[PDB]
Amino acid sequence: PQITLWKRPLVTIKIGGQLKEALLDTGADDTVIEEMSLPGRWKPKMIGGIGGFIKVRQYDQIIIEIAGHKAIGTVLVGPTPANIIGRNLLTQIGATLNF
Amino acid sequence: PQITLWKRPLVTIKIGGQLKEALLDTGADDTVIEEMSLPGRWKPKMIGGIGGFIKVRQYDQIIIEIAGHKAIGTVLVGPTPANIIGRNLLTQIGATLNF
Numbered sequence: 662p663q664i665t666l667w668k669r670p671l672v673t674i675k676i677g678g679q680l681k682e683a684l685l686d687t688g689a690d691d692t693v694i695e696e697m698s699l700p701g702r703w704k705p706k707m708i709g710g711i712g713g714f715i716k717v718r719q720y721d722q723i724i725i726e727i728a729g730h731k732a733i734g735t736v737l738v739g740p741t742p743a744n745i746i747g748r749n750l751l752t753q754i755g756a757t758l759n760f
Numbered sequence: 761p762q763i764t765l766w767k768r769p770l771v772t773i774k775i776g777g778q779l780k781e782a783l784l785d786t787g788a789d790d791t792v793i794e795e796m797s798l799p800g801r802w803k804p805k806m807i808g809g810i811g812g813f814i815k816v817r818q819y820d821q822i823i824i825e826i827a828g829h830k831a832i833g834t835v836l837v838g839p840t841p842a843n844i845i846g847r848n849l850l851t852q853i854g855a856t857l858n859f
């Protein structure tokens with residue numbers, strides 16, 4: 662699809678069998694989602710945003726559907742103001758920015 | 761252009777007569793620039809993201825050149841870790857996400 666930016670670019674995602682809303686975020690290196698349970702082991706990561714740094718849980722090789730497109734990759738879990746789909750998974754679904 | 765997202769979508773901007781590098785951020789409602797002086801009146805604002813909130817100065821009707829495209833709108837100025845072009849100006853240069 663072609664998504665204009667007059668509103669937040671919110672899409673439905675599916676992760677763990679659960680549907681959630683997430684923001685397509687070209688300004689995010691990584692994908693970050695609100696607290697939820699994911700399978701497997703996790704590793705620590707610190708990420709930065711506009712207000713400073715937070716600790717998150719890094720889960721690798723997680724199956725996630727984004728706007729009906731399948732991705733398998735790293736998902737960070739932690740106290741984020743919004744579920745965000747970052748460039749690691751935007752590249753998997755072939756997204757580009759155009760103007 | 762068409763910008764792929766293998767790397768951060770960084771562009772050159774001109775604001776207040778200054779050249780800066782900035783990130784095209786579809787996950788940002790607002791445009792936020794590192795500390796600088798801008799003309800006219802401003803008002804205080806709090807903006808949030810990962811890590812919490814920062815206090816910024818809100819200037820309205822500011823013109824910015826983004827990768828050669830002029831746009832006008834509100835620019836926020838404050839202690840942001842990165843210069844960010846948000847949706848309020850991305851819309852004006854006709855930026856879309858496509859996949």
Ligand SMILES: CCCC[C@H](NC(=O)[C@H](C)NC(=O)[C@H](CCC(=O)O)NC(=O)[C@H](Cc1ccccc1)NC[C@H](CC(C)C)NC(=O)[C@@H](NC(=O)[C@@H](N)CCCNC(N)=[NH2+])C(C)C)C(N)=O
Pocket residue numbers: 684686688689690691692693706707708709710711741742743745747783785787788789790791792807808809810841842844846
């Ligand atoms: C080479 C990598 C080294 C570092 C490596 N990476 C990072 O930490 C990278 C740089 N961080 C980022 O890319 C993070 C996203 C998290 C992540 O990807 O991990 N990006 C971001 O946080 C970018 C801006 C940014 C970019 C780079 C540096 C700093 C800031 N903004 C995304 C963020 C989304 C929002 C839902 C929380 N938007 C914002 O922060 C904007 N905020 C807004 O638009 C708000 N009004 C809306 C949400 C807030 N909620 C609320 N008020 N209830 C703001 C810029 C005007 C790491 N630490 O592992």
Ligand SMILES: [Cl-]
Pocket residue numbers: 733734735749750
């Ligand atoms: Cl990944």
Ligand SMILES: [Cl-]
Pocket residue numbers: 832833834848849
């Ligand atoms: Cl505006």
Ligand SMILES: [Cl-]
Pocket residue numbers: 665854
């Ligand atoms: Cl349009």
Ligand code: NA
Pocket residue numbers: 799800801819820821822
């Ligand atoms: Na003004």
